Design a protein around this nucleic acid. Structure first.
Ligand SMILES: [Mg+2]
Ligand SMILES: [Mg+2]
Lengths: 189, 143, 72, 61
RNA sequence: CUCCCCUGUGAGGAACUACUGUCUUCACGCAGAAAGCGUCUAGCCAUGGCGUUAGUAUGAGUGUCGUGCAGCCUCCAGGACCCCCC
RNA sequence: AACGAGACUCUGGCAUGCUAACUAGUUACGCGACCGGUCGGCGUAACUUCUUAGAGGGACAAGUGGCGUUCAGCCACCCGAGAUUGAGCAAUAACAGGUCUGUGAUGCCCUUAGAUGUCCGGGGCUGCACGCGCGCUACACUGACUGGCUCAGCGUGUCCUACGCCGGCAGGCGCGGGUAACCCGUUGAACCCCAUUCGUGAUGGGGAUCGGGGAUUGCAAUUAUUCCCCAUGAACGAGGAAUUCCCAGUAAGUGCGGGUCAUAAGCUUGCGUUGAUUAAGUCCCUGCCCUUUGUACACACCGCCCG
């Protein structure tokens, strides 16, 4: 059997939306043991649609300068974050990644129109892959800004921001920036 | 874990005010003439444990650490651990602390000012003495 | 605002560490140090004592990041 | 109301800087209604878009 | 023009203490808004950023008191249904 | 039809088929050790999978299926080491680009014995109220420290340096090998990985500026050449208007070699290692290209020309 980080179970999780069912990974096959597969998903267009979602959260956690090249910092941090999550909510920690992706992603977003220096935005709507990507961005950035100096472990602070991104609370930096995007979308229309 | 009843929140050593809720070596470091390194030497010499916060120490440990730091060469504090190795006038090995450090600075300025040398002219006009390139940098603090 | 935390424990705070923390679900040294206004080393060594007492389950330990769960 | 949408064809890319994709929308309610729509990020045919304002139409940037 | 499957909070019960999960009240730290008022920037101009309103108005959660909210039975309703209209 | 583009050369990826190797190893068998194995420990036969490097194969949009005047070619999939390897060379033309300072490559001018010559001894290119520029290092919790565990490649060398012994550290002494797949060197490089100490404050983050000492190089170090021990421990709280470089073993982190070099890399030139976010699109901006078009310009808009 295939068990994530040795203690989890991937095949029992669920997806409630049709748009994010075709993109978000780790359901049927793609489920692996460890996040780092060192594969090439940027090789061709939408070939990064199929890589494991946990690896996807993993790749984006190196995103600031000193942490850049070090990938393992993440498969460390993503390790303790899941094991924290299961203690709080008490559900499959890979259900919490699904719900945070689904809720944190924008829906409608604004595209800047005008001349440089004058921002006048018009509302368009997000593509599924773009939804996933922006969502995960928001998750990692929310975790960083929240964890800079509170002296929180990023394990603790990402479990925080993830569970909060899943529940729908305004605690998550993620849900915040989403809510701003949708609201500007409302402003314009 | 512990709950010390007698704890000195403000400490006084060698004319200076020491913060003891800090760790021990890094509280001793606060005074002039001591870094983390020489602090580890003196506190490994006095037998004082490094696990204690600086406020749990009895007066005997503070007085034996003081006694260790006033008299360097008696306690087998290595000759290369001393701040001023051979001083210009007496020719002696001495570990220089706050007021003595500041004073030795003032004096080694005055000597070079009376002598009429280049180190001292440099130190006089407010220039960096090491021959640094003063074209580009060496600005801040100036009008 | 400037932050004061307890370097060594107080009786008041000790009642909180002793009687409360075992009910907390997820326990992290930063979580304990945030709600009890304890300092880092003292809270860390506090959980090191709550290890020896047997009141707390240790899930995993990596370098500076530790994970603790309430007993049953 | 919240709605769902299907991608029938990809037409061109609208944008100043070439940002938006201009795509064609079927409704997943089995209705035959056909509306052009602006979408951001990558789109390939067959995908489903969630519309918060479902009666809106596409304009050229 | 209906009837009867599931959703609600309108009335009666057991339960309510023991069961579990949510809203009350107090200590706790964390994110944290705007009407506006000013400023800066788009040649001129805010529909924007940034200051001040204020770390206010707030909301998510942990531990105290509730004799609560409940979950189990009925209807009164509301919606899927049908019909019907096409 | 011809040059330019491509082709080509140089580099990386494929070969359990071939040609072979005591100056590279492997398998096998002995001896050696400590509890059948573990060992860069010591020697003999066995061969090329490893390690090299030659020969030649291999990829041609090839195979299948879609979009295409079913035409080029464009997309998806399989079969596969590879369905995008990175650099060099670069036409007809031109610039009134940089080059008397790289040339025993020069046309003029000046200098030519108190020389604009040359050598000798010192100073100066390094100076400091200021602007503008590359680049280093940081602003800490994905972090600093302290111990522990195992990793590279390109090159350099008559100077690289094996092992001892004295040296807290830099360093001395010595005794050795190599013109190098032989000796440095199983090149035990840095992150990273595992434990430890630190606990949001100018803090152990940051280390400038200094005051003393030891050691090297050199004739010669003061104007700190560098290196090393203690102290001194300042700016710095993620950087305003603007803007730079970049699409896959890539950005970025991290050390390492070659150049300069008696002693020297905050520079350059290479080299591996850990290794992504996002796009496979558009002329908005910037930049040049064509096409149409107007012209009283052709020394070509720095043009022409009217009072
Ligand atoms: Mg243009
Ligand atoms: Mg003419």
């Amino acid at each position: 059997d295939i068990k994530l980080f040795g203690k989890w179970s991937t095949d029992d999780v669920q997806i409630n939306d049709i748009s994010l069912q075709d993109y978000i990974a780790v359901k049927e096959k793609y489920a692996k043991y460890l996040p780092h597969s060192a594969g090439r998903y940027a090789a061709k267009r939408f070939r990064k649609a199929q890589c494991p979602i946990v690896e996807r959260l993993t790749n984006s956690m190196m995103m600031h300068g000193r942490n850049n090249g070090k990938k393992l910092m993440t498969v460390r941090i993503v390790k303790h974050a899941f094991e924290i999550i299961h203690l709080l909510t008490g559900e499959n920690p890979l259900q919490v990644l699904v719900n945070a992706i689904i809720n944190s992603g924008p829906r409608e977003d604004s595209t800047r129109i005008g001349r440089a220096g004058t921002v006048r935005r018009q509302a368009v709507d997000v593509s599924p892959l773009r939804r996933v990507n922006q969502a995960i961005w928001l998750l990692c950035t929310g975790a960083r800004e929240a964890a800079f100096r509170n002296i929180k472990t990023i394990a603790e602070c990402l479990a925080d921001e993830l569970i909060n991104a899943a529940k729908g609370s305004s605690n998550s930096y993620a849900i915040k920036k989403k809510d701003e995007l949708e609201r500007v979308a409302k402003s314009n229309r | 874990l512990v709950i010390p009843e007698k704890f000195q929140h403000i400490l006084r050593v060698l004319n200076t005010n020491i913060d003891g809720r800090r760790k021990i070596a890094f509280a001793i470091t606060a005074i002039k003439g001591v870094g983390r390194r020489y602090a580890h030497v003196v506190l490994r010499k006095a037998d004082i444990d490094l696990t204690k916060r600086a406020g749990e120490l009895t007066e005997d440990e503070v007085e034996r650490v003081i006694t260790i730091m006033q008299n360097p060469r008696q306690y087998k504090i290595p000759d290369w651990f001393l701040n001023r190795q051979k001083d210009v006038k007496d020719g002696k090995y001495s570990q220089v602390l706050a007021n003595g450090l500041d004073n030795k600075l003032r004096e080694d300025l005055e000597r070079l000012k009376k002598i009429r040398a280049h180190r001292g002219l440099r130190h006089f006009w407010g220039l960096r003495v090491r021959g640094q390139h003063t074209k580009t940098t060496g600005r801040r603090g100036r009008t | 605002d400037k932050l004061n935390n307890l370097v060594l424990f107080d009786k008041a705070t000790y009642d909180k560490l002793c009687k409360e923390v075992p009910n907390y679900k997820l326990i992290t040294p930063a979580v304990v140090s945030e709600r009890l206004k304890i300092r880092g080393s003292l809270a860390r060594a506090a959980l090191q004592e709550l290890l020896s007492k047997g009141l707390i389950k240790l899930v995993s330990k990596h370098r500076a990041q530790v994970i603790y769960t309430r007993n049953t | 109301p919240i709605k769902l949408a299907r991608v029938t064809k990809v037409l061109g890319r609208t944008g100043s800087q070439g940002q938006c994709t201009q795509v064609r929308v079927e409704f997943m309610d089995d209705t035959s209604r056909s509306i052009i729509r602006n979408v951001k990020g990558p789109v390939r045919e067959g995908d489903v878009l969630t519309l918060l304002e479902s009666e809106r139409e596409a304009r050229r940037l």
